[PDB]
Amino acid sequence: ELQPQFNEFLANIRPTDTQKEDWKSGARTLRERLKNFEPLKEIVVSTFLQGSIRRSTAIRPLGDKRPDVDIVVVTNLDHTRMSPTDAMDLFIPFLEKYYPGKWETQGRSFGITLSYVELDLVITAIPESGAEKSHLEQLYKSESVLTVNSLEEQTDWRLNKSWTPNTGWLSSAQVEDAPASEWKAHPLVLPDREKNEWGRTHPLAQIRWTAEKNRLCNGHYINLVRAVKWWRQQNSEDLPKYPKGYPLEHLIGNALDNGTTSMAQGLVQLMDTFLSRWAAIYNQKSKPWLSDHGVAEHDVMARLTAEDFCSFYEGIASAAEIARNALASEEPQESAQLWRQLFGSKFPLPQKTGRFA
Amino acid sequence: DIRSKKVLIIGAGSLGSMIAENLMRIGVVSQGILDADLLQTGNLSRHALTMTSVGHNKAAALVEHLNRILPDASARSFSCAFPPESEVAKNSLRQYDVIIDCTGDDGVLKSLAAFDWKSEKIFISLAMTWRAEGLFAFAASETSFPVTDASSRFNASASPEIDMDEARIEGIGAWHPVFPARADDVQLWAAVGTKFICRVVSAPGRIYEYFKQMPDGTVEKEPHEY
Amino acid sequence: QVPAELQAALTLINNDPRMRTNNAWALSADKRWSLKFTAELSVPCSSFMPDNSVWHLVLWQEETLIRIEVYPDKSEGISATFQHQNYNFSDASTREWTSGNPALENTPTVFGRNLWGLEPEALLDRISWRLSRLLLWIDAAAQEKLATTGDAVELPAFPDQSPFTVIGFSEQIDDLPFWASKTGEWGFASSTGLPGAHGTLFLREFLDNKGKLIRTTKWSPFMRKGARTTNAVWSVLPTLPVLAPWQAPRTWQELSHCFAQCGLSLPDLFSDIGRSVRALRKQRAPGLLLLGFPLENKIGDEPARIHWLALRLQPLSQEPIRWVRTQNWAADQLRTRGEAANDIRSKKVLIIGAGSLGSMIAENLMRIGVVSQGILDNKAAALVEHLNRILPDASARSFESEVAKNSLRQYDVIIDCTGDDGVLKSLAAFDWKSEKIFISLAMTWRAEGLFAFAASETSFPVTDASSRFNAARADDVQLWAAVGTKFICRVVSAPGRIYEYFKQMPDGTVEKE
């Protein structure tokens, strides 16, 4: 089903290698600098990478725009006594010292400008006490959390404190996920948009769920997410501003069914299921209610309006029609052109210098 | 600021020996030299040593010559090839602050990128072009060495193309040629490299500069903005 | 379990029309993965190489690099050593392959430029590249076209050559006729050990059967002051002692066979050497044997020089021969990596001032080719010794009376690096009795700039130089020394009245006015 062309398209819409090494080295350097700072030595507990970069669901920005990299700093502060503003203000001297003239505060996060990427770090705290805090800290200091490789590179990653990177000469025991009784009921607290109150977040469960869903779909979930994001970017004129980002990924993950064979079949099934599920809500002009993986009491589609959902539904209907007529076509060139009608021109059609010393 | 740093130099050939000698003469006393080849008579056409060091390991002879310079010198030699095999050697290597590459080999860049340094270092890469017409200068301050960025910067610069006509065979009864470079060109580029190293150590960051020599005797510089 | 890339490699070997394999991969105790496969030929087979040869693909890793090599099979593989290939020797070990791995990286003329291409980075692509190059190599070796017209004549690989001992000699083009008439004769020779070096010797003088001098080699004054010991025997051969196709002799019997093929007799030579050793009471015992033969630089050219090979010194024995590496230290063979033009290399140069700039300029000039230098300024003696310890062909001279004045007048280029006005006045007031080239170089305050003045007259013009002039860290001195050396070369190339002023900038650039 034109699999090599889809592979080339995916390779085209992925972030470049310079940006990848840039964000890896930046995360490692930031972690080391945070560890070595005396004023924040005891406060800081861990610093790990999150976001679509960690989950391998990120696309290449058009132009020279720097990609967004999400980082989390876990501290041992008490949120019941300290306001979010004080906690975020504890980090100003560090940014002024190590990153002069390149850092900026906005909303709930700080923004650091690197050579090719932009970091976006958030200050969080542990809401537990006693031995539960000790166990959570031991989990957060493990190699499973403190790794900088994406999910695509490590297909053997498991949320376990006894997991180690399996490296072979060319290509041992496969440890499994930890029981849900040890991590599922312990989320983290982070500041809100206005830095007036602490919210609840839990990204480790999101990473675990994404990895498991990718494993059950034979490594097609993240590629489908990237393809849908690229489709949204291309047809931006006829589509609303929202949903985008994590909510769009949540919709895609909900729509899919386990056991994906190929990318085109996966896309067709995804769009068909999406049209089938929310038809009743669409004809009533409302929006769905979807519960977050980490926190079950939160709605991901909380800030989305009904008209945005309706416009997205219409766009999905048109894309589903195009994909349906594209899949059935047997002529490779016609099918490739039909696929290019949606994805764009990046869907294909069927030097070392000398240095002496 | 640079006289109190421990400096590690990889490659004790033409450029490396001159850079090390200049650094030892200007005050940098804690140096470590890493090389695993032997010195020959042909190498002396562009080198800092003499015939009394022929047949020795390059690193050991260079270290002795450096230690015979000033009464406060303290240099060490590593005869293995990067990266070392023993864990003790790696622990010894991780004690240095500034890492300088003067080999001109891509494998060394990849080995530097794949090595675990366990802390933040300053990485400097220096190499010459065909016929010694230019100089590549790259610098960074990270925990890991960025190789893709350095390679892209090297490829982006305008440099002479390699022509085999100017490449002379090393001698009678041999097959491999050698690259052309006179002693004065290497000395010029060694001085420029020492100045660049001092400037980078003063203000660490992501820096790339390309130098060019002109027939009238002038030196021009083309920087890169990040 | 066999990993995936090895299975892909096995599939690649099986898919090739001119290659077959049945055995599977096998891991060794030394962490080496090996596979046995057979190769075919598309060209008529020769005696030295059969059509169906058996090889062994081996992969391993030392520190961070993955080594891919193909080795002949110890049972059904090739046994001869060709060009672009290590020595093919089978030892008594558990290994199933010999040590004669072809050097696929080297590109002979038969190897097409487009066919050669470039080496990839992925393991599978590298394997395919190596296999294609191996097929080309084997067909070329079958055709005996590995070495063709235009290629350099590389010496054969000598088994068990010590990587520490080297013997140095000096042979030029003009010495060929002297040895051309001595084909088949033998005599004695003497050698001296290099002071301060590790395991290096060089030849000094050549004798005859009765111990009479016939030729002496000229060395730098540093090398000449040494003891000479006669512990060698030389013999001139018509050609290079190489067995077919390019195999170096390994045992004394093979050497005797090559001698008989040439038209000489090793046992007769040994008997004569023993008899002459008995006759001469002064001689103790020779310890080295030198073999001389005309040698070309490219295939298809005619010989123009004599090359000498050495071995540690019976003819009928099967013991291995101990070979010693030799190098030619002739003047034209010392600076193949870059040298100055002939116009300045044939000049006698006098330098005034053994200070900072002068010593560096002298060292650069000695390293780039100018070997006749006079140091006038102890600083001069130390500088002369250091200059003489640089290369084998250095000739430096250290320093009222009429004879001394003439000696100074014998030079061609006069360079001033003193920065003193009295020296300029003395240069102007001296009688050189002939035309010379005068160059004056000086640094400014804080080594920010350089004054360069050049003239070609019978007397040095001091007023013009002073009017032009009116109008530190080691790296600064080195920079100005390099610039001054280039300026000297340019001036000697085209003499005249030239004045230039150079200035260094904070960013690292240099500007000229």
Ligand SMILES: Nc1ncnc2c1ncn2[C@@H]1O[C@H](COP(=O)(O)OP(=O)(O)OP(=O)(O)O)[C@@H](O)[C@H]1O
């Ligand atoms: N509406 C939401 N509900 C729950 N978690 C969210 C929501 N929005 C963001 N997050 C969390 O915050 C992280 C960072 O959010 P962000 O807006 O940068 O999204 P993203 O997936 O990184 O987007 P992009 O693909 O545009 O880079 C997400 O990875 C997710 O863990």
Ligand SMILES: Nc1ncnc2c1ncn2[C@@H]1O[C@H](COP(=O)(O)OP(=O)(O)O)[C@@H](O)[C@H]1O
């Ligand atoms: N950068 C981030 N890191 C971790 N969690 C985040 C981040 N941004 C948003 N979230 C989570 O996503 C949820 C949605 O946040 P948002 O829509 O901004 O709600 P609010 O406006 O109430 O903060 C929040 O509960 C928060 O926990």
Ligand SMILES: *OP(=O)(O)OC[C@H]1O[C@@H](n2cnc3c(N)ncnc32)[C@H](O)[C@@H]1O
């Ligand atoms: O210009 P040049 O060829 O003389 O410089 C090469 C020098 O670099 C050293 N070298 C090269 N590669 C390595 C590795 N991997 N480890 C250590 N030293 C290395 C050469 O020995 C030569 O001095």
Ligand SMILES: [Mg+2]
């Ligand atoms: Mg993001």
Ligand SMILES: [Mg+2]
């Ligand atoms: Mg963000």
